[PDB]
Every structure is written in C-alpha cells, then in structure tokens.
Amino acid sequence: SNRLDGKVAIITGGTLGIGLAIATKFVEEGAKVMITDRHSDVGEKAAKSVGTPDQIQFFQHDSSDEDGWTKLFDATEKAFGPVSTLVNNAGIAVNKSVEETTTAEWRKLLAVNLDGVFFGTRLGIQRMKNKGLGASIINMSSIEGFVGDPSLGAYNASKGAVRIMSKSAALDCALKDYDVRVNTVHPGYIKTPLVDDLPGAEEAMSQRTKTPMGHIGEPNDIAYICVYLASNESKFATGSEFVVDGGYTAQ
Amino acid sequence: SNRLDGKVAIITGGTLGIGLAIATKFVEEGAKVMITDRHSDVGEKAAKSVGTPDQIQFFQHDSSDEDGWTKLFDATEKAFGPVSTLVNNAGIAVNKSVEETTTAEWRKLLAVNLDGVFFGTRLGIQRMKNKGLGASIINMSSIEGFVGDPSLGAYNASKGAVRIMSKSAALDCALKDYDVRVNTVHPGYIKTPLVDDLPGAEEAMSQRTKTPMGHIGEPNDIAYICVYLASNESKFATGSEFVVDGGYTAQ
Amino acid sequence: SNRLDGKVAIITGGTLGIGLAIATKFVEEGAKVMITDRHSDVGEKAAKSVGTPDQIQFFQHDSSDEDGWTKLFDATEKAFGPVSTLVNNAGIAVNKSVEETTTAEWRKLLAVNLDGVFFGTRLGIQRMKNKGLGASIINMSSIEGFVGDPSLGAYNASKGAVRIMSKSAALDCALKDYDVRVNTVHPGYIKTPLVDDLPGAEEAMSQRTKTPMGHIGEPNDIAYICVYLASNESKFATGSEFVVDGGYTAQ
Amino acid sequence: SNRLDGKVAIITGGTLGIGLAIATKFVEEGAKVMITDRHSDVGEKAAKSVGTPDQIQFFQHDSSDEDGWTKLFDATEKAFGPVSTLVNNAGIAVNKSVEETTTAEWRKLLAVNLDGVFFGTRLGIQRMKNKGLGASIINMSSIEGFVGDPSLGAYNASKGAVRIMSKSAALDCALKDYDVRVNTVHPGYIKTPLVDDLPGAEEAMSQRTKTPMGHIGEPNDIAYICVYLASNESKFATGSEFVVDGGYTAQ
Numbered sequence A, B, C, D: 001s002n003r004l005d006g007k008v009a010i011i012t013g014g015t016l017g018i019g020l021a022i023a024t025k026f027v028e029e030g031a032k033v034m035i036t037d038r039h040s041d042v043g044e045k046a047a048k049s050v051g052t053p054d055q056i057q058f059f060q061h062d063s064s065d066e067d068g069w070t071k072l073f074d075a076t077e078k079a080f081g082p083v084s085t086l087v088n089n090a091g092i093a094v095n096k097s098v099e100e101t102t103t104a105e106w107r108k109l110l111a112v113n114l115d116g117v118f119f120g121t122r123l124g125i126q127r128m129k130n131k132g133l134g135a136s137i138i139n140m141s142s143i144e145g146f147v148g149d150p151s152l153g154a155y156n157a158s159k160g161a162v163r164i165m166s167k168s169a170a171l172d173c174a175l176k177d178y179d180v181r182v183n184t185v186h187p188g189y190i191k192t193p194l195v196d197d198l199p200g201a202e203e204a205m206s207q208r209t210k211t212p213m214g215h216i217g218e219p220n221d222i223a224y225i226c227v228y229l230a231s232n233e234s235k236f237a238t239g240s241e242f243v244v245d246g247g248y249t250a251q
C-alpha cells in the first residue's frame, strides 16, 4: 500500500497478461494508470476490471504510431496530471529464425518492439524531465534480450536493442540531472491466457532444460518488480536489467 | 507494511551501513531479524536502535567462522522460529592491486567475503529447504562483481566468485524443488559513516566518470531491493543479479 | 600465411579503416575478398591498394539495400566461387541522445546498422549453409553493444540488436548443422583517418576514464580477431562476442 | 608460423588435454614453452612429444604451491630467457552442489583454481612488466565463469573469481603502462582422454540442450584462441573474456 503515492503511469499493452497485472498492482499502490492497446474492445472492460475512472482509464493506441504517442501523453495528463512513469510493455513476436524472417515480418516486429519503445522513451524523457516527479521509464524486455532463441530472430534483435538503448537513455538522464531513470525488466516464461491457448507451450517452457524451477511464472511476478522500479524505493537504480526468469538465464 | 510477514531473517554484518538499513526495513515489513558482527560492542545498541527483542536481536559472529554459523542459525531459530531468509552481507576490502596483494591479505579477504558466503549459503540451503518457508538467500555483492577496479584485486575475486557461486546454488535449489531462491545484489557506491570518515571518498565516487548520477546512494537504496528479494513478491526470481548503482556499470 | 586458404569473403564497408584492414589481412592469409561501399570512387582504388583482381575486387552497394545484397553475393560467386565468409562491417553513427534523435535519424541509422546486418546475415545463412565451406558470419559491433553512450542512442540500439540477433542466428545454424557460425566483434576506439579529422577525438577517447590503455587502437587490431573468426581455427566458436577495446568495458 | 616469435611461455597443467594442445601450437608458432604438472611421470614424455628441449621443457609444480611459482619462473628464464607469456591452465573439479561441498573439497579446489591463478598472475605481472616483451597472461576459465552448474558449486566460485580478478589485473597493468595484458578464455566442453574415460560424458555434453553444435570441441579449439591472445596480434585486447563453447552460453 502507498508505494506509488502520487505517481501517474502509462502502461502500453496494459489490457492483458503482464501489462494488466502491472496496472492492477500499480493501482493498488496508489498510482493513477492509463493502459493502452491497439484495439478498443478489450480496453474499457480491462480498465473497469481493475478500478474506477479516477484510478485507471484506457486509451486506444498502437505503440508503433508515433504521433499517437503525444495524444496518449496529453490524455493521461488531462485525466490524472503530469505523467511520472512509463512502462513500455507492448510487444509482439514472430516465430521465425533469422533465416526464415520475411522483410515484412522484420519491419512489423521492429515497428512495435523497437520503434515503439524508442518513441515512448524519447517522449517520456521530454515530458517527464525536470519536474521533481521521481520519473521512471521501465522498458519491458525478456530473457531474449540476453540469450538467443533460434526461432525468435527478429524478437531477439528488438530485445537486445531495447536493452542497450535503455542504458544510453539512463546515462543521458543521469548526467543531465533530469530526474528520470530508465531500466529494463526481463521476464522469462509467464503463464497467461494466450500461453494457455497454445497447446503444449507451458509444458515445453517448464522443462528443466528451459526453466529450472520446473514451472512458468505468473503476471504478478512481473508486476511486483515494476512496482519497485516505478517507486522512489529504486531512486538509485538506473541503466540496469532486472531479470525474473525462474533460473532460465542462470544455466 | 507486511511485505515480509512471518519471515525470519539472518543478516550478517547487520550493525552498520547497508546491513543496518536492510535490518531496519526488514523489521518494518514484519520480519524477525538476527543481525551479526564480529564485535559485540555495537551489536546490542544497533539492535535496540531498530526495535525490541521480539523484533530484532544481535548474535556475535565472524562470518569466516564455520562452526559459528550453526550456533547462529540455532540462536535465531530459538528466538524466532525457523529461519526463512539469509542476507550474506558481511564483507571487507583490501585496497591493493592484484600485483601488490600479500598472501595474508588475500587469505583474510577470501575468508570473510568468499568462504563466509559459502558457509552461510551451504548451511542456509540445508536448514531452509523443504519447509514451505518461501526461503531466500540474498548474497551481497557489488559493482565489483561485474567490473574490475585496479585497486581492489582480491575484492574483485571474491565478488566474481559469489556472483557465479550463487547461480550454481540457485539452479540446484530450483531443480531439487527446495523452495529456496538465491540471488545477488550489487550496490554501487553508498554513503555511510565509514565513507564519510575517508576524506575525499564520496566526491571521488560522485564524479560522473564513476557514478553518472553525480552522487552516491544511501543504505535504504540497498534495503529496498533486499525487501523485494526476501519477500514472496520475487518467488520467480532466482539465479539473478540485482544492480543498484547510479549508472556506474551502464557506461 | 595460409590461415584463410580457399575462403571467399564479402566485407561490407571494406574501403576504409577497420574494413580495409580486415580486407588486407584476409588477402594476406589467402582469402579472396569482395569489398563494398555505398560510393564507387574510393572502391577500386582501395581494392587495388590491397591486391590484384584475382585477390580482391570492389562492388558498390549500400548495405541498407535489400535487393542489392543478392547482386553482391552473385558478383562475388562469379568472381571467386561460393562465398564462405561474410563480415557485416558497414555502419554509421548519429551523435544524438535518445531524447534528441529525430525519427529520420533513427530510421536512417537502423537501415544501415540493423536492417543491413539482418539482410546480410539472412542471405549469408541461405547461401552459405550445407556446402562444407566452414562458413563464418562476423557481425561487426562495438563496445556500444555492451554499454551505453548518452550521445549514441540509436547507435546503442543498433549494436545491442546485432549482438543478440547474432546469437539467435548462431543457435539456429548450430542446431540445423548448417556449417555456418555467427559471432560478433566489439571494437573499442580505433584510430582512422576519420577520427584524425575530428579535432580532440582521439585524445578524448584516450583518457584513462575511457580507454585504460591510455591510447586508442589501430585497424589491424580488429583485422586479426576477424582472421581468427573467419578461419577454421574458430570452428567451435559460435554465438559469442569478441571484445578488443583497450580495457574500456572492463571498468 | 611465426605468430609467437621470440615469446617465452609458461603453461600450467600443460601435459594433457587443453594445456598440451596450447603447448603444441605455441611451439609451432615459435614460442619457447615450459609446461607444468603436479606429477613428474607424464611431464618429460609430454614435452618430448611436442618438441626438443630447446623448444619445450617440463617443470614439476603444483599451481597451489606459492613458493614453487618463483622456482618455476626462475627455471623458465634460465632455459629460455625472460618470460613473456603465462597461461594459467591448471585446474581441478569437484562434482558437488554448493549444498553438498565439504569444506575440505572447497579449500582444495580454491587452492588450485583460485589461489594458484592469483599466485601466477601476481608473479607474472611482477616479472613481466616494463620489459617491452608484449607480455600476456591468459587465465583459463570456462563456461562455468558465466553460468551456473548445480553440480559444480566450488568450481563456479573459482571461475567467477578468476573472471573478474583478471579484469582488475588487466586494468591496473593498462593504467600503469606495464606492457602486460590479462584476459580470460572460456572453453565449453572439450573432448580429451579424461572425458573419454567417463562413460556417457561426451554424449551428455553433446545434447543440443547443452551444446547447440551437437558435439563437443577438441583441445586445438582452445589452443588457437590462446595463440591469438599470446601474440602481438591482440595488443589492444585486455580485460576481456574469450568464449569458445559451441553455443553453450548463447542459449
């Protein structure tokens, strides 16, 4: 309780899974939250499932849409006051090796996972700096920012990009005394309804050769590290990677 | 509040600085705590400064003392019930390059920083496994587990050892379903009375070429990441490194 | 001598600096080489400066040009026989923080440094696999694939992308028994005529807080690690990062 | 040929496997070599199998023996002139988890794998600095300096220690203009007669979940990266890790 008092957060892809759990715990800890998704039909229902309009609202936005980012920040500031916290969580995956990735697939994945995170990070620094907000940008990544997956070529590219791009931003903010931190979060496998719909997926992810714990995580596992990062408790943490992966990358 | 409900923690070197702040926040969040130090004179006063005997006690112990580790676990279990949480925080430094390290210096530093962490980790796994405690071993490290310092040769050795030793332990616990997680915490520079007593030290640490934030951290910066790691909020985190360094390792 | 006997290499951006030195040492060790650059005026002269047409030729190509990649592989195979070795060396830099990067700058840098490396890697796997060539793809990176630079935001993104994308490709090639390895090379600061034309640049790079050796490297420093990687001497090395940086990333 | 002209190398544990292959290729490239082992019976035969006494000799030495290190450097300088190159290759393994490691096992493994590497590194810096030798210390590590193995607890400790200790030494040498570089080499699984004597071992190591190439390496795979590191070709490489692992750590 109260760990995010006064904070105002944007969470992209906040209607499902990890992003929804981050939204839920953010509201529980006192933050006001704007969640997004490319589609409108889930959004209002997702928001209402967490809290009331004074706590959480929905804004339809595709994170690859550069001009839509300014509309999103404006709507959030209108609802809740100046934005303090950005969680760049929206992402997609292509299940292809590098060898088998089409250029269209490459460009589509990079538009969401890389351009979108760049647009959000750039705008968030501009809008959040020098306001005494204790501002925090949390760029969602994954184990795939540290290790390869033969069947996730473009996804690996995007996650490695966000990993090191975030360090650049962290350093510049720290050196300019902007009062903006930038860090990455790296989930391993997490159980969601989407994983549940893929026959065999959780079992494959839970083999000890993949996740040493012998089971995948849950959305709140990623929510709680995000609360820590969004809060002033982490005021000395910037430019770093926070891994919550059941041991996947330790072997 | 309540984030460590029911937890029972041992924190080595818990009478000063980082270890004292970890103890303080642990008590605030509902944990019972046994702090240690090689010396007795500070201990009881340090404990009483945090809370009452039902919350926190002191046990004199040099972490390099193998047999003393069993006495420490026994005393803690006597006071508070079965131990759930171990923070291996006790450490020393030698200000020497590898080239200029004497063998006595080498052996003394490794006894505390490496052997002591091994003894605590080994015993903690034995005593904490298979009890449904949500057990957590937090091995204190530093930026010096990732990067070299020309003037900290043996210290670097110790911190690199603990970094990877902790991953081994994490994996074995995860694969054996022991209900014990093992992670490392990596502070950058932190202001304490000891740093304050070293003329010029904080200023040197605060140069942008060292810490990009332009200032060093405070003990609570390390306390809060430890609360997260000791809590069930981090039940999917094992075998990982948590860095709180003001950007030091991001450049 | 003879360390690249029978090898046929493409080196993008091979007319200057690092790429020219890689070309030079490749020819010395018995490889046939096709160098590229976006511009034609330097190319033939650069090639003739290294060797004769039976050793080394030039092909004008912008690495961001997807269709031009197939023309490049065809021209090389026409000149020298099947390509065994690809060094993705072409790159550019934008001297901007993330905050100050324009979208046009972002897209231009990613087209060369990321898309271009993807196009070359994808095509090289397709054209080099299953031919008993001892094929090797060497994706040029830099220290900026490991650490941030506040003034190199998009460049950091690109270098982190190539770092982890290359691991994906490595794994898929290894698992499919393609006889193609993929590794990254990470130069620190290297003296070239271009650096020499930037007043103050080498001196700034040579400060001990940047490069511990107190001086920057030379193009042959990167050439020699590339020879090792292109050769069968490194037949068990794949998915790894090879750093030649004067100590920059060790502190 | 000639890549180590004039170099004088000490290779600890140089009578078998990886160390023998390093010795072999070092001699082939023009270096004079002193190999060691704790036992005498294999040594002279191993040396004679590589070359004549003017090329390679044997010195009986347990790398854990501190005073024996000065005798070893003296004998090498007597045979061949001033030592330029040290490969700290001697090591042992204990097949125990952290939990199950006895203190005697811990101390024995650390004496060879950590103390021994410290003694060699410290003495080598002292004896090799400021002589214009192009001096190089190559500290053998393994994949177990990057990732955990649940059954290699003390070994992981030792390998993580050497990894970061070597960076400290690298930095101090670079900052003091000592003309001594320090780097680590990280073999994955390598086929040797010892592995061949362990039923099932190579097959287990060759599973794709362990080594993506689907087979283990050979001693020359580690020899060739050591030649590069010992040579002046790598004069700008210090403080870095060189991984030759068949993809083990890329996933």
Ligand SMILES: NC(=O)C1=CN([C@@H]2O[C@H](COP(=O)(O)OP(=O)(O)OC[C@H]3O[C@@H](n4cnc5c(N)ncnc54)[C@H](O)[C@@H]3O)[C@@H](O)[C@H]2O)C=CC1
Residues within 6 Å of the ligand: A012, A013, A014, A015, A016, A017, A018, A019, A020, A036, A037, A038, A061, A062, A063, A064, A088, A089, A090, A091, A092, A112, A140, A141, A142, A143, A187, A188, A189, A190, A191, A192, A194, A195
């Ligand atoms: N489920 C898993 O096992 C793992 C997930 N992750 C990563 O963590 C993050 C969050 O995942 P979840 O929210 O559980 O995802 P989900 O798979 O349950 O649903 C996808 C999420 O992204 C959003 N989204 C997709 N494209 C978008 C666009 N163009 N604009 C705005 N929103 C968009 C949706 O609202 C949705 O919340 C992602 O960045 C993902 O790549 C990483 C490793 C594992």
Ligand SMILES: NC(=O)C1=CN([C@@H]2O[C@H](COP(=O)(O)OP(=O)(O)OC[C@H]3O[C@@H](n4cnc5c(N)ncnc54)[C@H](O)[C@@H]3O)[C@@H](O)[C@H]2O)C=CC1
Residues within 6 Å of the ligand: B012, B013, B014, B015, B016, B017, B018, B019, B020, B036, B037, B038, B061, B062, B063, B064, B088, B089, B090, B091, B092, B112, B140, B141, B142, B143, B187, B188, B189, B190, B191, B192, B194, B195
């Ligand atoms: N102050 C700083 O800038 C940094 C500190 N650290 C690390 O973080 C950890 C905690 O530091 P602080 O508690 O602030 O230290 P401190 O420097 O303020 O005091 C030393 C601590 O270690 C204990 N200690 C030393 N030798 C011991 C032994 N043989 N047995 C039991 N206890 C012993 C003392 O109780 C004391 O709390 C250490 O492991 C340290 O190496 C890491 C980076 C920076």
Ligand SMILES: NC(=O)C1=CN([C@@H]2O[C@H](COP(=O)(O)OP(=O)(O)OC[C@H]3O[C@@H](n4cnc5c(N)ncnc54)[C@H](O)[C@@H]3O)[C@@H](O)[C@H]2O)C=CC1
Residues within 6 Å of the ligand: C012, C013, C014, C015, C016, C017, C018, C019, C020, C036, C037, C038, C061, C062, C063, C064, C088, C089, C090, C091, C092, C112, C140, C141, C142, C143, C187, C188, C189, C190, C191, C192, C194, C195
């Ligand atoms: N000079 C230095 O200090 C450092 C250089 N690097 C990196 O190493 C690599 C090689 O650098 P140099 O050859 O010395 O570069 P250079 O700065 O001396 O010249 C640029 C090179 O890239 C090529 N190039 C640029 N855009 C291109 C395009 N669209 N298509 C084809 N070729 C193109 C040119 O032929 C030229 O060889 C690059 O990827 C660079 O980013 C990394 C760290 C430091």
Ligand SMILES: NC(=O)C1=CN([C@@H]2O[C@H](COP(=O)(O)OP(=O)(O)OC[C@H]3O[C@@H](n4cnc5c(N)ncnc54)[C@H](O)[C@@H]3O)[C@@H](O)[C@H]2O)C=CC1
Residues within 6 Å of the ligand: D012, D013, D014, D015, D016, D017, D018, D019, D020, D036, D037, D038, D061, D062, D063, D064, D088, D089, D090, D091, D092, D112, D140, D141, D142, D143, D187, D188, D189, D190, D191, D192, D194, D195
């Ligand atoms: N075979 C494999 O799969 C792997 C080996 N390694 C590492 O690479 C290095 C070299 O291995 P190999 O020479 O093939 O070993 P080996 O297993 O074939 O034989 C052991 C080597 O270490 C020496 N040795 C052991 N204790 C010693 C002491 N107290 N003093 C002096 N010498 C001693 C022996 O001469 C012998 O060459 C070691 O540091 C090892 O830990 C790392 C990963 C895998």
Ligand SMILES: C[C@@H](O)c1ccccc1
Residues within 6 Å of the ligand: A093, A094, A095, A142, A144
């Ligand atoms: C990395 C994880 O988000 C994933 C991506 C594609 C298919 C399954 C799982």
Ligand SMILES: C[C@@H](O)c1ccccc1
Residues within 6 Å of the ligand: B093, B094, B095, B142, B144
């Ligand atoms: C790394 C940090 O704990 C430190 C060690 C010795 C002297 C000053 C600071």
Ligand SMILES: C[C@@H](O)c1ccccc1
Residues within 6 Å of the ligand: C093, C094, C095, C142, C144
């Ligand atoms: C990283 C290095 O290639 C560089 C890039 C831009 C300006 C100067 C140096």
Ligand SMILES: C[C@@H](O)c1ccccc1
Residues within 6 Å of the ligand: D093, D094, D095, D142, D144
């Ligand atoms: C890591 C490798 O050297 C190994 C150690 C012990 C038993 C088998 C293999």
Ligand SMILES: [Mg+2]
Residues within 6 Å of the ligand: B147, B248, B249, B250, B251, C147, C248, C249, C250, C251
């Ligand atoms: Mg650094």
Ligand SMILES: [Mg+2]
Residues within 6 Å of the ligand: A147, A248, A249, A250, A251, D147, D248, D249, D250, D251
């Ligand atoms: Mg792995």
